[PDB]
Amino acid sequence: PHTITLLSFTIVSLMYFAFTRDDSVPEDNIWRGILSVIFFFLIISVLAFPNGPFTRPHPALWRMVFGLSVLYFLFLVFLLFLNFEQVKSLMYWLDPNLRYATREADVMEYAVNCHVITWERIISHFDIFAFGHFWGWAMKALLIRSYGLCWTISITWELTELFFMHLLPNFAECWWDQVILDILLCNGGGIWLGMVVCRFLEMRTYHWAFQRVAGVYLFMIIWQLTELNTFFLKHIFVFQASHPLSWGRILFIGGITAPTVRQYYAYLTDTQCKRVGTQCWVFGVIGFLEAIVCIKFGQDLFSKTQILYVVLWLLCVAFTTFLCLYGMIWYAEHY
Amino acid sequence: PHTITLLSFTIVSLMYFAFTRDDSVPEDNIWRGILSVIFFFLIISVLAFPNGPFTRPHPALWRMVFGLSVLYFLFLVFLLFLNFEQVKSLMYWLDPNLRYATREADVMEYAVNCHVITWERIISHFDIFAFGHFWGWAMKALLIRSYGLCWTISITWELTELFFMHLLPNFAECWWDQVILDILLCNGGGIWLGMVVCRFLEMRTYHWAFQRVAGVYLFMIIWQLTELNTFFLKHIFVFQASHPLSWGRILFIGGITAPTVRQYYAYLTDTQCKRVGTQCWVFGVIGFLEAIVCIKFGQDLFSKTQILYVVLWLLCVAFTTFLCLYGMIWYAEHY
Ligand SMILES: [Ca+2]
Numbered sequence: 001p002h003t004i005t006l007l008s009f010t011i012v013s014l015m016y017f018a019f020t021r022d023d024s025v026p027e028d029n030i031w032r033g034i035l036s037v038i039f040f041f042l043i044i045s046v047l048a049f050p051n052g053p054f055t056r057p058h059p060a061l062w063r064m065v066f067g068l069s070v071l072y073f074l075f076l077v078f079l080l081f082l083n084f085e086q087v088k089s090l091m092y093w094l095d096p097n098l099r100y101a102t103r104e105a106d107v108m109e110y111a112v113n114c115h116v117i118t119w120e121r122i123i124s125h126f127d128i129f130a131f132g133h134f135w136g137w138a139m140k141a142l143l144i145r146s147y148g149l150c151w152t153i154s155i156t157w158e159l160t161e162l163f164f165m166h167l168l169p170n171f172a173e174c175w176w177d178q179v180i181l182d183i184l185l186c187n188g189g190g191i192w193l194g195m196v197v198c199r200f201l202e203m204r205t206y207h208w209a210f211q212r213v214a215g216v217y218l219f220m221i222i223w224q225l226t227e228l229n230t231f232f233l234k235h236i237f238v239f240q241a242s243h244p245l246s247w248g249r250i251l252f253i254g255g256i257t258a259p260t261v262r263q264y265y266a267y268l269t270d271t272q273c274k275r276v277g278t279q280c281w282v283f284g285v286i287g288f289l290e291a292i293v294c295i296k297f298g299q300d301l302f303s304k305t306q307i308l309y310v311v312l313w314l315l316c317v318a319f320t321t322f323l324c325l326y327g328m329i330w331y332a333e334h335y
Numbered sequence: 336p337h338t339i340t341l342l343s344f345t346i347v348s349l350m351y352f353a354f355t356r357d358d359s360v361p362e363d364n365i366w367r368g369i370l371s372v373i374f375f376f377l378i379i380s381v382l383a384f385p386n387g388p389f390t391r392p393h394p395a396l397w398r399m400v401f402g403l404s405v406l407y408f409l410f411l412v413f414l415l416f417l418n419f420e421q422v423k424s425l426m427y428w429l430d431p432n433l434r435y436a437t438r439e440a441d442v443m444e445y446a447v448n449c450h451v452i453t454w455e456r457i458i459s460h461f462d463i464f465a466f467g468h469f470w471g472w473a474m475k476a477l478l479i480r481s482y483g484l485c486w487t488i489s490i491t492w493e494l495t496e497l498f499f500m501h502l503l504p505n506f507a508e509c510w511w512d513q514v515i516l517d518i519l520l521c522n523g524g525g526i527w528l529g530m531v532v533c534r535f536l537e538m539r540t541y542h543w544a545f546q547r548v549a550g551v552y553l554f555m556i557i558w559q560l561t562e563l564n565t566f567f568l569k570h571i572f573v574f575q576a577s578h579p580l581s582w583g584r585i586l587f588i589g590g591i592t593a594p595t596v597r598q599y600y601a602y603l604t605d606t607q608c609k610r611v612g613t614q615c616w617v618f619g620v621i622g623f624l625e626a627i628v629c630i631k632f633g634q635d636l637f638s639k640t641q642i643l644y645v646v647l648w649l650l651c652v653a654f655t656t657f658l659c660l661y662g663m664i665w666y667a668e669h670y
């Protein structure tokens with residue numbers, strides 16, 4: 001009796017908490033209502049939603065994940081209709097402290113004269129972005145499960161930062177920062193650790209090696225767009241990278257992406273079951289809607305964009321993806 | 336390409352309507368956002384939700400129905416947390432005209448001296464409730480598909496009105512009204528027409544003829560509770576039986592009940608597939624939550640209720656259900 005026990009105990013707890021508590025404070029009432037709606041939507045998701053491609057930890061968890069994905073998609077569909085003032089008011093209601101917050105890029109100097117080696121600057125890098133790079137790349141290596149594709153994405157993200165450096169003037173990094181730290185160390189160790197963990201724990205290791213020439217390219221484009229919507233949202237709706245919104249969205253996207261990459265790999269070379277399911281389309285639409293919301297609400301960064309780089313980073317990502325695919329095919333063929 | 340065409344055209348229409356329109360009026364923005372969230376939730380429902388027991392008209396329609404059911408269930412879960420002032424404010428926002436509306440039972444006289452036969456009163460019955468009885472019972476005969484069970488419910492509803500006459504003093508009807516019109520004509524013709532339609536259109540005809548002694552009783556209890564929540568809601572949150580809320584909820588409940596009765600009949604005597612699915616549990620929880628919301632927000636009708644009738648109409652419904660079951664079993668056995 002799964003549904004019988006799951007939809008009769010929670011209902012009793014719901015009616016108990018509804019009757020026993022007070023109802024004077026209106027905003028607290030609205031917050032409790034939102035929390036209960038989210039909880040019961042997760043329950044309905046566990047009850048009636050497709051299982052998905054993963055069944056190891058629990059088949060029910062990847063139904064709560066689909067429910068969260070649908071909730072975020074509908075939240076973006078809603079947020080697409082408000083104006084800037086209403087979205088800012090909603091942000092202030094979520095956290096009042098966001099009322100007093102300045103952009104990390106409005107008043108700050110990046111890519112300063114970079115020849116110095118004094119320890120005053122080097123040790124002050126592990127604050128936020130180094131932790132983010134390292135452990136986020138461990139998570140991404142768990143999602144991707146490859147040394148080739150992970151390193152390709154790590155190399156492509158630096159090109160993306162370089163090309164989109166005229167909109168958000170914080171992607172500007174010292175040349176001895178991108179190549180040394182962000183690539184060789186801060187991400188290299190992260191990929192190494194993520195793959196060592198993926199091998200220790202009994203997981204698989206995808207290969208990605210026709211239709212793959214364009215499939216992997218579309219995958220790379222969606223990946224870069226989703227990794228860029230983070231900074232777009234952080235810059236349009238002002239807040240910091242430490243506010244719970246930023247890393248909350250990061251962890252949520254990692255969770256939603258864990259089954260999406262598997263479904264896309266299944267639709268890719270398996271010579272078997274294909275026609276990628278719903279979760280992949282929902283994730284693609286989530287990425288597209290985040291991009292659309294950024295383009296709509298910002299309208300000031302993209303006012304000064306250049307179409308000489310938006311259509312050139314595409315070609316650079318395409319060349320990087322083709323070279324990575326050929327290198328992986330050669331490594332698999334000769335070894 | 337079902338999802339490919341369904342989730343790429345609607346997204347383009349969404350972004351077009353979002354960018355092209357204005358955003359000055361805040362309440363209109365919130366209303367458009369709610370409408371778009373409902374529409375895209377119906378799309379997600381068509382994409383990923385179980386088919387159900389019906390497949391004749393279209394298997395997708397009974398996914399939009401499940402989506403609407405989940406939406407109403409979550410709406411009740413939310414409404415359970417607000418206070419009376421917030422619910423009344425939400426009602427006023429849905430329709431401002433509800434600000435000036437009086438109860439049809441606060442100032443009105445029912446069950447007056449009933450011996451007169453002058454045509455002044457007889458012809459003035461087909462206003463709202465006669466139409467409701469007749470065509471609602473056509474719909475109920477389409478949902479139930481039986482002369483025995485439909486007549487049993489039609490006879491049990493008069494007992495329910497008689498027993499719950501001390502809370503809402505509008506159930507009081509002339510004895511020559513209930514027996515003659517509401518039973519023999521206003522519902523009799525409705526059941527006859529509904530069954531003639533169910534035979535004309537190529538449908539089935541359930542039988543309902545152990546575990547059925549209690550199953551049909553629970554079905555009858557849920558049916559009466561759902562038919563009574565209508566008047567409870569109409570009396571607690573003041574409005575009329577002609578306001579779009581009343582008949583909108585009636586049609587919605589009919590739609591949600593169309594597959595629920597089939598799933599319950601399947602779990603009942605078929606000697607085959609059993610373990611009634613999710614839709615039946617969702618409908619039962621919807622009925623229970625409507626009852627709980629009425630009990631919470633009213634708290635004035637039920638303050639003067641009598642536990643000598645709430646535990647007696649149960650026994651009367653049980654006796655009526657047992658007698659109907661025995662009569663149907665005898666009619667099937669000897670004929
Ligand atoms: Ca970098």
Ligand SMILES: [Ca+2]
Nearest residue numbers: 493496513517
């Ligand atoms: Ca009646």
